[PDB]
Amino acid sequence: GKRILLLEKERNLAHFLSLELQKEQYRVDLVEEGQKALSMALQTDYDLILLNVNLGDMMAQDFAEKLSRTKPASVIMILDHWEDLQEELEVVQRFAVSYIYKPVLIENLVARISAIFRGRDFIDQHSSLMKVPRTYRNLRIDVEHHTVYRGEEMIALTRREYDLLATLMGSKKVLTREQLLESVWKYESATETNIVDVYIRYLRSKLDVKGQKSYIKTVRGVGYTMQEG
């Protein structure tokens, strides 16, 4: 089964989530602080890393940035109280594939994790069919390693940003926000179209060079497409 790295500060909840996730045949490694979580995530490829906003010895944002130096498309999901998540909402959107509020309902957590895994699988399969060369202007995508480069620099795209780029680069046509939702949030049927604009903004911030045309064009009345220089 897929492998989950789990850090939950509430002891009884951590134990509960560990046991319930193993009933889905997932392999669950429970850790209690970020330093240990980080050493484990650096040496093992986890399919999901499930964290609180604050890991105790560091913020989850800090963990994610440090992990991203070698594994930029890591799949991190944040579980926390509403007030804790909202205090850090913008930074959480930037590094996490999803977030979920306490008090958690296990059937909901299980369904969401399943959908996230299936959506990543879809992206992988679809991107394997991308026309070669997988380049655009100064960008190149390494589909095997889920990495992106602009010139000779690695661009630390998050998993959502990577999935969004692969979807845009793999399309010959302008894509609507509904079509982008259907590809990048596939199987996460509760996702709504305004999230697409958020991640287009994030993706532009990572790709774009000041004084060049953006890598992504907004097409009036339609949606988004890659943009030439």
Author numbering: 2 to 230
What text comes from the article?
Here we describe the two-component-like orphan response regulator RitR (Repressor of iron transport Regulator) as the archetype of a novel family of peroxide-sensing transcription factors in the pneumococcus and related species. RitR contains an Aspartate-less Receiver (ALR) REC-like domain, which retains the common (α/β) fold of canonical REC versions, yet lacks “invariant” residues in its catalytic pocket required for typical phosphotransfer, including the phospho-accepting Asp residue crucial for the histidine kinase-response regulator phosphorelay.. Here we show that RitR regulates pneumococcal iron homeostasis in response to cellular peroxide concentrations through its single Cys (Cys128) located within the linker domain of the protein.
The X-ray crystal structure of the full-length reduced state mimic RitRC128S was determined to 1.7 Å resolution with selenomethionine (Se-Met) Single Wavelength Anomalous Diffraction (SAD) method. Thus, to eliminate any heterogeneity caused by this phenomenon, we mutated the redox-active cysteine residue (Cys128) to serine, which would be unable to oxidize and activate the protein. The resulting RitRC128S exhibited no evidence of dimerization in solution using both SEC and 2-dimensional nuclear magnetic resonance (NMR) techniques. The RitRC128S (Se-Met) mutant crystallized in space group C2 with two molecules in the asymmetric unit. These molecules are nearly identical with root mean square deviations of 0.69 Å for all Cα atoms, are independent, and do not form a dimer with each other, nor with any symmetry-related molecule. However, more positive charges are visibly present in PhoB, as RitR contains several aromatic amino acids in these same positions, which are also (notably) able to hydrogen bond with DNA. Finally, we observe that the trans-activation loop (colored magenta in Fig 3), responsible for the binding and direct recruitment of RNA polymerase, would be inaccessible to RNAP in the RitRC128S structure. Combined with the fact that RitR requires oxidation to bind and repress Piu transcription, from these studies we can be fairly confident that the RitRC128S structure is reflective of the inactive, reduced state. The most unique and striking feature of the RitRC128S structure is the α5 helix linker, which connects the REC and DBD sections of the protein.
